[PDB]
């Protein structure tokens with residue numbers, strides 16, 4: 012296994028220092044530390060003995076200043092919805108939670124620029140801006156728990172990426188506390204600014220190994236006047252791909268989401284969350300969302316799209332909704348697959364970028380390679396972006412299944428020149444599989460960046476660079 | 479201001495470069511004149527060596543030699559940069575991407591383009607448009623600028639409102655570092671969270687951290703319908719309401735919103751002989767839309783125009799969908815920078831400001847500088863909060879400089895604005911970044927420069943403070 016690096020340990024004097032620095036924000040009770048020590052999948056557990064909950068950036072600066080002088084390792088944590096073990100300690104790293112850094116600083120109702128603390132919950136930010144007729148540029152099934160700071164640190168993708176793009180584009184600025192407690196102010200709430208190096212980009216997707224994000228400035232799209240959702244059954248993956256092509260050709264700029272899921276996903280969502288399918292049983296399903304300025308025009312585009320899709324046999328059955336309640340009901344069938352999977356058993360999880368034409372091949376392969384040893388194998392996700400969520404469920408973890416899955420899935424993916432972690436990131440789980448997607452010189456430059464910014468390595472050790 | 483202690487090019491260095499890039503060592507003094515002068519013709523280097531590599535390996539071997547020999551290197555693209563970043567100050571070797579102009583691949587379904595850094599933007603637009611795709615950026619310099627230069631400066635431009643930043647649209651980069659090390663970040667995937675997004679360091683790094691040799695970029699689909707409305711507005715308040723209504727009524731099809739003042743129109747007419755298509759107005763707005771259903775777009779433009787004329791926001795307007803008339807209208811905006819440089823000496827500021835007060839500095843400068851300036855103009859990417867502010871005089875005046883600076887930079891800082899929205903920093907603005915960046919940021923920038931290029935051979939005297 013992995014060996015604990017020679018960091019110091021938390022003393023009573025350290026506890027008293029933290030009580031001085033964040034009054035009422037020091038949690039030491041072992042039973043209270045249980046939950047923050049366990050990851051979302053419940054397959055990794057740390058042994059942290061202290062949780063710190065600052066309210067302000069200055070408090071984070073002072074905490075890290077102390078940890079730097081004392082050589083104490085720190086595990087930043089947001090919503091703890093991460094999928095790659097990055098969010099919980101390996102040994103006894105201090106858990107630094109942003110839960111109480113949850114204030115909105117400002118919102119400009121013309122530019123649509125939001126500035127808020129890192130621990131603001133995504134769904135809550137959505138409620139805040141939507142009250143003002145804007146939306147967040149990203150959305151994901153974790154919205155109820157994930158923090159904007161976590162989203163920036165992981166460079167989260169999600170359900171509207173196809174329309175609004177990367178956080179590398181929509182984040183306008185960051186305030187970041189470095190490992191020695193230096194406050195880096197890159198919080199330029201401006202749409203455009205070419206005044207030197209774009210330092211904030213370094214912290215988007217860096218997963219807390221280069222600094223702790225404390226404040227975010229983000230560009231919020233305007234709220235669409237008209238939202239439509241279509242939910243369609245396709246008789247094969249080829250028809251899914253042609254449905255995508257036709258969808259881009261006929262809906263065009265109003266397209267805001269394209270998601271697929273297979274028959275097994277639908278069966279599991281029905282079985283564990285009791286959500287009935289609104290279309291005839293099909294081997295594949297597709298959820299399409301549109302967002303636009305003119306209801307009538309979007310309706311015409313969608314109507315012609317559906318007529319043509321059903322006409323050429325790409326879709327066997329379909330349903331449409333504009334009512335907010337029904338739209339949300341349709342979205343639940345896609346959003347809650349991940350929950351249903353973790354209720355089905357032990358989950359082997361893979362998050363892959365592949366050539367869209369070959370996105371589902373691995374699922375067929377694994378269904379054949381694995382026998383009755385897999386309880387289920389599923390594929391679903393952000394097909395428009397080339398992103399497959401591959402999952403295998405079983406009654407319990409097994410070394411034999413792991414040996415069948417790995418390195419086979421990663422070698423297949425490298426064979427397709429794909430990404431072994433499209434959006435979820437690296438963290439603890441994937442730190443040793445980056446060679447399938449990144450050349451050695453890049454990994455070395457990443458290590459040099461880490462050495463520059465955190466020479467003591469107190470921020471999220473054992474992640475998210477190779478050993 | 480003062481030359482750093484770099485080596486000098488010897489005869490043996492020339493023979494080495496001839497070995498590395500045979501045919502690509504230009505030493506003719508008359509041939510070196512043009513690459514030593516920046517686009518504005520206000521900076522002039524004294525470089526005696528231009529190298530024109532063809533491949534990434536040639537670049538790698540050149541920089542390896544320059545690192546061992548401590549020779550300064552000035553990367554150069556199309557030489558359309560505006561901040562003196564693209565030409566030597568003293569005797570840096572000019573490394574041109576002019577011959578690195580091949581397309582390597584283009585996926586006709588995903589729209590992913592892989593090309594060498596020296597491909598000219600216009601030529602790439604032609605290439606991908608023949609295949610029903612477009613570049614995610616466009617600028618008035620399209621005819622000369624290289625994709626490598628666009629990435630190195632993080633160019634914004636005329637369709638930024640729709641497709642956004644190169645920070646979002648660039649998918650991969652091959653970069654050659656100061657010691658010759660080839661950094662491969664040339665992925666062609668839309669989504670890849672396998673470590674740090676290293677390529678981001680080089681977008682906007684202006685050749686001080688590495689030389690971009692290959693670009694992978696996501697091309698948007700080519701629109702079925704492009705419309706342009708060129709409108710005359712009777713004041714800036716009405717410009718702002720035209721913008722607000724435009725967003726409410728056009729929405730997702732909007733691909734451009736540019737503005738210009740009256741003096742700009744007069745200067746393009748006077749110096750470029752381009753006639754106005756609408757009545758004389760104090761302000762002009764160019765709106766472009768791009769969509770997949772030409773009839774829906776046309777209906778949206780109709781309702782928008784009818785309401786804008788009806789509510790008095792616009793006085794006179796012309797619309798165009800024919801490609802020729804679209805290009806005619808676009809020329810009135812695209813060529814303002816050229817018309818300005820033909821009016822005399824140009825004091826050029828490129829600011830990000832709150833949109834609601836984007837033009838206030840123009841009126842302030844017109845009152846502050848009475849008859850001592852020839853013209854003060856404001857135009858540019860209003861949708862993105864970016865004002866191009868220019869003052870022309872028949873000749874440069876130290877008086878007029880003292881009136882403009884630091885005043886303009888102080889006003890911008892008072893608005894928490896950017897003193898270089900688009901064009902970057904280069905040589906001209908290296909010592910005015912404090913108006914937009916705090917000292918800790920600039921310090922970290924210097925630490926990254928020191929990590930990636932400890933000898934400082936890549937683009938000295940730029941683009942960090944002295």
Ligand SMILES: Cc1cc2nc3c(=O)[nH]c(=O)nc-3n(C[C@H](O)[C@H](O)[C@H](O)COP(=O)(O)OP(=O)(O)OC[C@H]3O[C@@H](n4cnc5c(N)ncnc54)[C@H](O)[C@@H]3O)c2cc1C
Pocket residue numbers: 051086087088089090091092093094096097098109129150151152153156157158159160161162164165166167168169170218219220222223224225349350434435438471
């Ligand atoms: C049901 C479900 C659906 C999901 N859907 C998606 C999806 O569509 N797309 C997608 O990309 N991901 C998705 N995810 C995973 C995604 O990574 C998380 O939902 C989210 O991005 C992490 O936010 P968090 O606040 O929970 O971060 P955490 O799990 O708390 O932490 C994530 C990582 O960032 C670090 N970190 C946390 N806060 C900070 C900070 N302030 N500064 C610096 N580093 C910090 C942590 O150390 C850790 O390494 C999903 C997860 C679930 C459970």
Ligand SMILES: Cc1cc2nc3c(=O)[nH]c(=O)nc-3n(C[C@H](O)[C@H](O)[C@H](O)COP(=O)(O)OP(=O)(O)OC[C@H]3O[C@@H](n4cnc5c(N)ncnc54)[C@H](O)[C@@H]3O)c2cc1C
Pocket residue numbers: 517552553554555556557558559560562563564565575595616617618619622623624625626627628630631632633634635636684685686688689690691812815816900901904937
């Ligand atoms: C008429 C006109 C209109 C313009 N409009 C706009 C506009 O709308 N928006 C906008 O943002 N800019 C605009 N610009 C300026 C813009 O910054 C440049 O035109 C553009 O970025 C391309 O630069 P280039 O190819 O000429 O590079 P160069 O000028 O040759 O170089 C620019 C800088 O980048 C460096 N560099 C160049 N190539 C490389 C490389 N391969 N690797 C590393 N470093 C490199 C150089 O050292 C220098 O510092 C305009 C310019 C003109 C003349």
Ligand SMILES: O=C(O)CCC(=O)C(=O)O
Pocket residue numbers: 094152169346348349352360361362392400401402
């Ligand atoms: O279930 C998974 O593999 C991850 C969840 C996710 O990213 C999604 O639901 O889109």
Ligand SMILES: O=C(O)CCC(=O)C(=O)O
Pocket residue numbers: 560618811812814815818826827828858859866867868900
């Ligand atoms: O004229 C200027 O200030 C620069 C050119 C430019 O970026 C523009 O024409 O949009």
Ligand SMILES: [Zn+2]
Pocket residue numbers: 168169392393400434
């Ligand atoms: Zn996902």
Ligand SMILES: [Zn+2]
Pocket residue numbers: 635858859866900
């Ligand atoms: Zn411009």
